[PDB]
Each structure stands twice: as C-alpha cells, then as structure tokens.
Enzyme design. Structure first.
Site, PDB file in Angstrom:
ATOM      1  N   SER A 272       0.883  -1.296   0.061  1.00 24.36           N
ATOM      2  CA  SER A 272      -0.245   0.332  -0.437  1.00 24.36           C
ATOM      3  C   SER A 272       0.800   1.246  -0.429  1.00 24.36           C
ATOM      4  CB  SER A 272      -1.007  -0.149   1.155  1.00 24.36           C
ATOM      5  OG  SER A 272      -0.955  -0.130   2.196  1.00 24.36           O
TER       6      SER A 272
ATOM      7  N   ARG B 270      -4.709   3.497   6.630  1.00 28.46           N
ATOM      8  CA  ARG B 270      -3.174   4.458   5.841  1.00 28.46           C
ATOM      9  C   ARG B 270      -2.937   4.945   5.193  1.00 28.46           C
ATOM     10  NH1 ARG B 270       0.404   0.040   5.421  1.00 28.46           N
ATOM     11  NH2 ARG B 270       0.016  -0.092   7.872  1.00 28.46           N
TER      12      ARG B 270
ATOM     13  N   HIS C 238       5.083 -12.955   9.545  1.00 31.12           N
ATOM     14  CA  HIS C 238       5.480 -10.949   9.175  1.00 31.12           C
ATOM     15  C   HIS C 238       6.347 -11.514   8.225  1.00 31.12           C
ATOM     16  CE1 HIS C 238       3.861  -7.433   8.486  1.00 31.12           C
ATOM     17  NE2 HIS C 238       5.679  -6.459   7.637  1.00 31.12           N
TER      18      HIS C 238
ATOM     19  N   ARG D 154      11.812   4.389 -10.452  1.00 34.56           N
ATOM     20  CA  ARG D 154      12.107   3.615 -12.321  1.00 34.56           C
ATOM     21  C   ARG D 154      13.005   2.440 -12.128  1.00 34.56           C
ATOM     22  NH1 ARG D 154      12.768   0.686 -16.263  1.00 34.56           N
ATOM     23  NH2 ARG D 154      11.572   0.688 -18.860  1.00 34.56           N
TER      24      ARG D 154
HETATM   25  C1  LIG Z   1       3.409 -12.754   6.679  1.00 34.70           C
HETATM   26  C2  LIG Z   1       3.761 -14.373   5.663  1.00 34.70           C
HETATM   27  C3  LIG Z   1       3.395 -14.461   4.551  1.00 34.70           C
HETATM   28  C4  LIG Z   1       5.310 -14.060   5.869  1.00 34.70           C
HETATM   29  O1  LIG Z   1       6.168 -15.239   5.593  1.00 34.70           O
HETATM   30  P1  LIG Z   1       7.434 -15.339   4.571  1.00 34.70           P
HETATM   31  O2  LIG Z   1       7.876 -13.537   4.291  1.00 34.70           O
HETATM   32  O3  LIG Z   1       6.710 -15.664   2.426  1.00 34.70           O
HETATM   33  O4  LIG Z   1       7.985 -16.082   4.921  1.00 34.70           O
HETATM   34  P2  LIG Z   1       8.813 -16.805   6.209  1.00 34.70           P
HETATM   35  O5  LIG Z   1      10.944 -16.980   6.723  1.00 34.70           O
HETATM   36  O6  LIG Z   1       8.295 -16.891   7.339  1.00 34.70           O
HETATM   37  O7  LIG Z   1       8.570 -18.331   5.854  1.00 34.70           O
HETATM   38  C5  LIG Z   1       9.428 -19.516   6.695  1.00 34.70           C
HETATM   39  C6  LIG Z   1       8.866 -20.712   6.453  1.00 34.70           C
HETATM   40  O8  LIG Z   1       7.279 -20.609   7.548  1.00 34.70           O
HETATM   41  C7  LIG Z   1       6.504 -21.111   7.235  1.00 34.70           C
HETATM   42  N1  LIG Z   1       5.757 -19.821   8.822  1.00 34.70           N
HETATM   43  C8  LIG Z   1       5.024 -18.642   8.614  1.00 34.70           C
HETATM   44  N2  LIG Z   1       4.457 -17.741   8.974  1.00 34.70           N
HETATM   45  C9  LIG Z   1       3.191 -18.935   9.585  1.00 34.70           C
HETATM   46  C10 LIG Z   1       2.742 -19.771   9.906  1.00 34.70           C
HETATM   47  N3  LIG Z   1       1.990 -18.222  10.945  1.00 34.70           N
HETATM   48  N4  LIG Z   1       2.333 -20.423  10.254  1.00 34.70           N
HETATM   49  C11 LIG Z   1       2.378 -21.983   9.668  1.00 34.70           C
HETATM   50  N5  LIG Z   1       4.099 -21.811   8.991  1.00 34.70           N
HETATM   51  C12 LIG Z   1       3.895 -20.193   9.201  1.00 34.70           C
HETATM   52  C13 LIG Z   1       6.532 -20.138   5.563  1.00 34.70           C
HETATM   53  O9  LIG Z   1       5.450 -20.555   4.798  1.00 34.70           O
HETATM   54  C14 LIG Z   1       8.232 -20.967   5.292  1.00 34.70           C
HETATM   55  O10 LIG Z   1       7.332 -22.059   4.635  1.00 34.70           O
HETATM   56  P3  LIG Z   1       7.859 -23.110   4.071  1.00 34.70           P
HETATM   57  O11 LIG Z   1       9.227 -22.630   4.229  1.00 34.70           O
HETATM   58  O12 LIG Z   1       8.062 -24.372   4.245  1.00 34.70           O
HETATM   59  O13 LIG Z   1       7.385 -22.494   2.755  1.00 34.70           O
HETATM   60  C15 LIG Z   1       3.961 -15.479   6.496  1.00 34.70           C
HETATM   61  O14 LIG Z   1       4.137 -15.313   7.693  1.00 34.70           O
HETATM   62  C16 LIG Z   1       2.337 -15.988   6.971  1.00 34.70           C
HETATM   63  O15 LIG Z   1       2.207 -16.865   5.891  1.00 34.70           O
HETATM   64  N6  LIG Z   1       1.337 -15.059   7.418  1.00 34.70           N
HETATM   65  C17 LIG Z   1       0.285 -15.607   7.961  1.00 34.70           C
HETATM   66  C18 LIG Z   1      -0.896 -14.055   7.314  1.00 34.70           C
HETATM   67  C19 LIG Z   1      -0.387 -13.209   7.850  1.00 34.70           C
HETATM   68  O16 LIG Z   1      -1.010 -13.160   9.190  1.00 34.70           O
HETATM   69  N7  LIG Z   1      -0.715 -12.164   7.135  1.00 34.70           N
HETATM   70  C20 LIG Z   1      -0.543 -10.571   8.067  1.00 34.70           C
HETATM   71  C21 LIG Z   1       0.654 -10.397   8.017  1.00 34.70           C
HETATM   72  S1  LIG Z   1       1.309  -9.522   5.757  1.00 34.70           S
HETATM   73  O1  LIG Z   2       3.977  -4.735   6.490  1.00 36.75           O
HETATM   74  C1  LIG Z   2       3.928  -5.517   5.435  1.00 36.75           C
HETATM   75  O2  LIG Z   2       4.265  -5.373   4.478  1.00 36.75           O
HETATM   76  C2  LIG Z   2       2.128  -5.785   6.097  1.00 36.75           C
HETATM   77  C3  LIG Z   2       1.115  -4.197   7.117  1.00 36.75           C
HETATM   78  O3  LIG Z   2       1.657  -4.909   8.029  1.00 36.75           O
HETATM   79  C4  LIG Z   2       1.363  -2.830   7.206  1.00 36.75           C
HETATM   80  O4  LIG Z   2       1.379  -2.648   6.168  1.00 36.75           O
HETATM   81  O5  LIG Z   2       1.069  -2.353   7.935  1.00 36.75           O
END
Ligand SMILES: CC(C)(COP(=O)(O)OP(=O)(O)OC[C@H]1O[C@@H](n2cnc3c(N)ncnc32)[C@H](O)[C@@H]1OP(=O)(O)O)[C@@H](O)C(=O)NCCC(=O)NCCS
Ligand SMILES: O=C([O-])CC(=O)C(=O)O
Lengths: 434, 434
Positions: free
Chosen positions: B242, B399, B318, B419
């Site tokens: 965002s 936001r 995260h 860019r």
């Molecule tokens: C936020 C998020 C997308 C970031 O993950 P990322 O930057 O892709 O990577 P990470 O370093 O956390 O991943 C490490 C491993 O743990 C896993 N992991 C991360 N969060 C997890 C959770 N809450 N439960 C289970 N597994 C999880 C990842 O999928 C990854 O597994 P893999 O290597 O087998 O594919 C991830 O923590 C997630 O799935 N969160 C749940 C959704 C959420 O709460 N989103 C809000 C914040 S934007």
């Molecule tokens: O930080 C991020 O990438 C997603 C988030 O939590 C926010 O934008 O507040």
C-alpha cells in the site's frame, strides 16, 4: 491447438524448470550494488524485478519476446487487405513467445468479441460521471468497478490451489482486454459526443475495428493507425510506472481489474502518460509564428531559448532509451504513405532534421532523437481525434496487452509479494557510519 | 503556531539541505547488494527506497518518526474523557516529526471537519453501486472519482514551480483525509444498513468520532477503539504494498487521490489486507471444532494438527518483523481492559500462550509471534461490526494518514520518478554470463 489457454498450459512447466535451474545455479550471484543515491533517486539503474514480456535493446529498441518492432510489422498477422500488425497477434506473442498464425489471431479476435459485454452497473457509473472528471480517472474507476466480475477474486476466497492462479488470472485478463474498448468508447462518447451509444460488438471484427466502430469512426486508415498504435505502445519493460504498478499490486494477488486500474492511475501521472499532449500543444503553438514553412533559427532559438531557458523540445528524451525510437519510425512511415500533404505531419517531418542538430551541445538529455510521443498526436488529430485529454486512454488500452500478458506469467511462475526495505534519511545516516 | 502548513514550510528547507549534504558526501556509499534471488523474490531484503515517516525495526516494531506505539499512546493527545491517541496527533507527528500540543490536535480536527464535503457525483456513484461490489472496490473507485477535486492536478497543468508541489499535495491530502470517513461510512451504510443516510459532520468532534457517528455506532468504547485502530494502522514503512504503490504512483506526479486509490487496490490484495478476515474465519471455525469452553491441550493438538496438514496459522509471522508486533500488544491491552471475558478474545489470548511455542519446534517460521491482524477481527466483531468484507476499509482509512504524510515529503524533497530496471530471465541469464 487454437485455444491459447491450453498452449499456455503446455509452456508453463518448461519455463518454471528453466527459472528453477537458473536460481539453483546463480540465486546468490550478485547482479548489482545499491547506493544511497539509487534509494534517493527512485531506484535508477537498479536491477529490481523480473519481467518476461519485453526488453529494451539499446541499439534496436523495445523487443517483444525478442522481436523488434520492424520484425513484428513483418511477421504478425494483419487484417485481411491491411498493412498494420493486429494487437491480438502482439498479445499472442507476449503470452506464448511465438508468432501466431493467422488462424490463432482469428480465434483470439473472436474470443475478445464474445467477452466484451459490460455489466450494467459499470455502464450506469460511466453514464453518470461529469465532464470535469478526467477520462483517465473514469477509466481507472470503471475498471476497478469491473472487479465485481473477477473470477480470480472468487476462486481465491474458496481456497483454490496456487497451481491454478494463472488460469483465473488468464480468464480475468482476457475478459478485461475484451471490455476495455467498450469502456474506453463509452468514456469518449459520453464526453465528446453527447452521451450517444457505443453500438454493438461485431463477432467477426478485430478488436481495433470494434474499438473504432464504438468510438464512432469509419475510416479504414484510422482503424489501421489504431492497430499499429495499440501494438507499439503495448509493453515497455517492467520498470515503467504503469507496468511496475501492475506488477506490484498484482504481487499481492489483487485481481487483473484492480492491478490494471492501479496501473492507469500511474499512467495518469504527468511524468508518465502526458507526453503525447505536451508535444501536440507545442506543435499547434509552433504554427503561431512559423505559419506553414520555416527554418532551424526558428527552431534552434526555442531549442536554445527553451533548453537553455529551462524547458525542452517536447519528445526528444528518455529514462533509459538511446536512439530514434522504432515506435516513432513506425508512425512516420505510416504518415508518409497515408497523409503526406498534411501541414502538421509536414512540420513533424521538418522537425526530424533540425532538432537533431546534435543537442548534445548542452549535454543535458543523453538522447538527441525523437521518442514515441513526438509523432502520436499529429496522427490522431489528422484522423479527427482532437480531444487531447483522451490520448492517454488510448495508451492505457494498449498497455493492457503488455502488463496482463506479464501478470499471467507472474502468477504462473509463482512470483511473490513485492516488498523491498525502506529506510529514513535518519536511518540511512546511521547505517552508513557503521 | 497552529497552521500546520506554515510549520511544514519552515521544516522543509532544513531537511532539503541535510539530504543535499548527505548525498554529496555519501551518495556513492554502497548499502546493499542485489542478487538474482532478490529479483525473483519480490525485492525481499533489498534496500529500495527512502521513506521518512516511519521505520520498522524487526526487533522493537514500528516507530513513527522515532517514537514507538507505547511512546505514542502516552505522548499523543486524547479526546476529552478519553484514553486512546487521536489519529490527528499521529498525522501531525508524521508530518512534522514533532509531538503536537492539545491545541494543534484541536486545530487539525476542525480543519478536517471543514474539508469533509463530497461532490454530488461521488455521492451518486456510491449510492448506485450494487451490493456485490466489494467495499474496497467502492472505496478505490470513489477516491479515483474525487480527483475531480484535485488542486494539484489543476496547478500542474498551469505550470506551477516544482518548489510548490508540496503545497498542493498537502491541500489535496488534507481534503482527502477529511473526506475518507464520509466515503467509508456511505459504503458501510449502503451495503449493511440498506442505504440509510450518514447524517452530518459535527465541526467540534474529532475525526474518529465523526466517523463512528456516520457509521451508526454511538458506543463510546467503539469510538475509543476506532481512535486506537486508526492510529496504529497509519503507517508501516515504505516497503508494504500500500505505501509502496502510493509512493510509486505519486512519483509520476499523480495527485493524492490517484496515488491513494492505487494504494487501496494494493491493499485489497489477499496478501496485503485480508489477513484480518482470514484470522477471524479460522478462529470462528476453530471455536466450533473444539467448542468455546476449550482446554490448553486440545488447543495445542489443533495447532499441531494444523501444522501437519501443511496449512498456515493465520495472524502469525511477517515479511520483516521478527518479534511480537506492538500493534498486536496494543489491541491486547485494549481487550484486557474492555472485553476480558469475551469468548473470542479469550481464545485469541490462549493462542498467544500456545501458538508461539509450536512454531519454534518447527524451525520454519522465522517470525513465530502474532502480527496486528491476529487481534483485530475480534475487537470489531465484539462491538457489532461483523461485516468482514468491510474490515480492510478501516485499514485503508488509517493508512491514508501515513502514505499521504510521506507523499507531502516526497514532493517537498523532490523525489524523482521510481523507475528500476527490469530484466527477463533470458536477459538476466546473459547478463550474469558476462
Ligand atoms: C506474513 C508471511 C506471509 C511472511 O512469510 P514469508 O516472508 O513468506 O516467509 P517466512 O520466513 O516467514 O517463512 C518461513 C517458513 O515458515 C512458514 N510460516 C510462516 N508463518 C507461518 C505461520 N503463521 N504458520 C505456519 N507456518 C508459517 C512459511 O510458510 C515458511 O514455510 P516454507 O519454507 O515451508 O514455505 C507469513 O508469516 C504468513 O503466512 N503469515 C500468515 C498470514 C498473515 O498473518 N498475514 C498478515 C501479515 S502481512
Ligand atoms: O508491513 C507489511 O508488509 C504489511 C503490513 O503489515 C502493513 O502494511 O502494515
């Protein structure tokens, strides 16, 4: 065979493996440094994203999946009894990496006619917009509103496998491309023709001809220019603001409608999408004093009395190019064939000798050659498309082809969320001491 | 004294000169490397942009101009009879870098009351939107349509000095922030209260209270929640989709309305702004499958059984945070105070006890602690706001404060077009082999 979706489905595994092999060989290989200046300077020169559909060749121009503009003019199917590349074929190429056959383009033409219908709520919304709401704002708002039709958004809510994202993205993207002309034409007719109707789609016309029909034009040469115009503006690498916006918003798994509408808000920005109009205002203004016939004094004065004054000779710079844009040559050949006797074209033809008086004297541009935007407006105006506020809509409709072809591939290839690290000035100052 | 615009005009030179010096001396300092993996991996771990309003240490969480959320909860003005920080004060901090007085907050509340009117075409558009058009789509489309009010867009066409960009951005930003609650509450009411009217703005209320009035809530606690919620979602660095979208679209000199509507299209993506909903759907499901009256083991079993099928625990982890999100703690503290016996809260609270354990024994997680979105749904559902499709509208309105504060500074400081350079896989492979 003709179904682009199945041909795509066969290509995607090969590409996934090719990327997997490359990342396993070279994932940790350093391709660039990041300086303090690049962070302050909008990431200039920083190699930041992968974008498969097009690449800037520094000595031949934009290539589409490897093919130069002249190559696309030769190879891509034309409409029967026509000279200009059909934008359908361009899309086929961007999606597949292959030059389509005539029958493939024909299939694709009919696919977009079938999917062209607008939901009444979008029709209503467009019909209700006032004339002071810019055409690009109307375009972005209507595409956003179209996301009520998003197949991708619904399937994601129901937990569809990642392995199928590309399929719904493909469906949404074809739907969007199909509708764009209808939306674009409603905007035009509502603003510039008293709200008269766009008429019907013809199941057997090409996209461009359905487009000019709905705009209310009936002029073979105008439809031919539209075909060329929609082809050459279609994609320009990933780093331009409209492509990058679509890439970035798309990486959060926003559907094609939201990603494209965000892109149009980026295209609407004066440092992206308004170069066309600047030039044409200038050329019109130039036939204040000049009349019809002049010299380089006439020219070099502003050229120096403007470039050394503060501004510019509009349409003679870029962010990364370096030579007479093939996108200009395209239109020039077009104009020389079809409107040699037009005053403004003639002026534009005259400006192509002079302003290249090696303006490197000032040393401030690194580009003494005309870009795409130098030629576009005169041709539009010649064919009776005089509403300059509308020109960036045409650019948008074109750019759809590029950014959607890439969006399909980004999801097919499992590209993650774009999320770089930011720093404050305070933060950076402390980071560098250490 | 109280005119934020004059206070900002005085700060800008100081900071311009500070950056000028820093870039002369340290502009060529290398602050990181780009790898092939980073390009494929959405720029992850890449220092890509300067963003002044907030900085997210992985360790202690978000800081707003050097202040943590606990420091802000204390220092920022509250409403009379109030405990929670007012978003007005948050915005003043982000803009000025200074904690505001009571008087400045009072002045900013009246400024936003005065600027809150919507033009008839935006009202009409919202009232005609169908009930199957998602609230974030309505929000984005309505904000795009407001750009008819853009002072910046009209100034730019008439050739205003670059030195004045920030002033028109500021005005347009102040107008948008003031209007957002009106837009947001029209959406809420049209979708979820059969089109009942939003009522009037009270010129002596704060922004959050006008908003809850227009929404149809008159529970003081829900207002206090809104004040807290709008404050804490306000900004999270420049790298989230965002803020980045807003930065990117802004850098082409798209006005605040277009930049913000683009950002909301980013925010509407499932990987950006739907975790709230996703958490709440999972908690509600869990509450059936294990009953409301739940043990500590049966909860650890379920979390164990979730991890095996290969499925995520929503609300944990995260992209950069690597500890408990202070925006979570904030919501916890508010819950302990105001709804400690709520079944859903208890469960959330229990999960904080349990879940971090198990993700430690995984070794896959990196961030085993909750983010903001783990806690937000249940606070909203509690106060009677159960329409999960609307939650991200609240996040968007929050936001706005952060991304617009920065947008003012990006123009003040003359940040250029964003860019980066893109490469194809083919192109990248050839570049590395060079
Ligand atoms: C936020 C998020 C997308 C970031 O993950 P990322 O930057 O892709 O990577 P990470 O370093 O956390 O991943 C490490 C491993 O743990 C896993 N992991 C991360 N969060 C997890 C959770 N809450 N439960 C289970 N597994 C999880 C990842 O999928 C990854 O597994 P893999 O290597 O087998 O594919 C991830 O923590 C997630 O799935 N969160 C749940 C959704 C959420 O709460 N989103 C809000 C914040 S934007
Ligand atoms: O930080 C991020 O990438 C997603 C988030 O939590 C926010 O934008 O507040």
């Amino acid at each position: 065979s003709t179904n682009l979706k199945d041909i795509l489905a066969d290509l995607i595994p090969k590409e996934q493996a090719r990327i997997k092999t490359f990342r396993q060989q070279h994932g940790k290989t350093v391709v660039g440094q990041i300086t303090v200046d690049m962070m302050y300077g909008g990431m200039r020169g920083m190699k930041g994203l992968v974008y498969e559909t097009s690449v800037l060749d520094p000595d031949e121009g934009i290539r589409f999946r490897g093919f130069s503009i002249p190559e696309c003019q030769k190879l891509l199917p034309k409409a029967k009894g026509g000279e200009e590349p059909l934008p359908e074929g361009l899309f086929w190429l961007l999606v597949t990496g292959h030059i389509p056959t005539e029958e493939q383009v024909s299939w694709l033409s009919k696919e977009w006619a079938k999917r062209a219908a607008l939901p009444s709520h979008v029709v209503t919304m467009l019909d209700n917009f006032p004339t002071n709401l810019h055409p690009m704002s109307q375009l972005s708002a209507a595409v956003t509103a179209l996301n009520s039709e998003s197949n991708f958004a619904r399937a994601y809510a129901q937990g569809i496998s990642r392995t199928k994202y590309w399929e719904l993205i493909y469906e949404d993207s074809m739907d969007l491309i199909a509708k764009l002309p209808c939306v674009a034409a409603k905007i035009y007719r509502n603003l510039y023709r008293e709200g008269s109707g766009i008429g019907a789609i013809d199941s057997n016309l090409d996209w461009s001809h359905n487009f000019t029909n709905m705009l209310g034009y009936t002029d073979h040469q105008f439809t031919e220019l539209t075909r060329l115009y929609l082809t050459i503006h279609s994609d320009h690498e990933g780093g331009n603001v409209s492509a990058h916006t679509s890439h970035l918003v798309g990486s959060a798994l926003s559907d094609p409608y939201l990603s494209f509408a965000a892109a149009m808000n980026g295209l609407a920005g004066p440092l992206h999408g308004l170069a066309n109009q600047e030039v044409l205002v200038w050329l019109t203004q130039l036939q204040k004093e000049v009349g019809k016939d002049v010299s380089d004094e006439k020219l070099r004065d502003y050229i120096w009395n403007t470039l050394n004054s503060g501004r510019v000779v509009p349409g003679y710079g870029h962010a990364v190019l370096r030579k007479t844009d093939p996108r200009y040559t395209c239109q020039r050949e077009f104009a020389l064939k079809h409107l040699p006797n037009d005053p403004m074209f003639k002026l534009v033809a005259q400006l192509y000798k002079i302003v290249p008086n090696v303006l490197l004297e000032q040393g401030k541009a690194k580009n003494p050659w005309p870009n795409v935007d130098a030629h576009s407006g005169v041709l539009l105006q010649y064919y009776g498309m005089t509403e300059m506020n509308y020109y960036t809509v045409l650019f948008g409709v074109s750019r759809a082809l590029g950014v959607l072809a890439q969006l399909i591939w980004s999801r097919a290839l499992g590209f993650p969320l774009e999320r770089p690290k930011s720093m404050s000035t305070e933060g950076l100052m402390k980071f560098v001491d250490s």
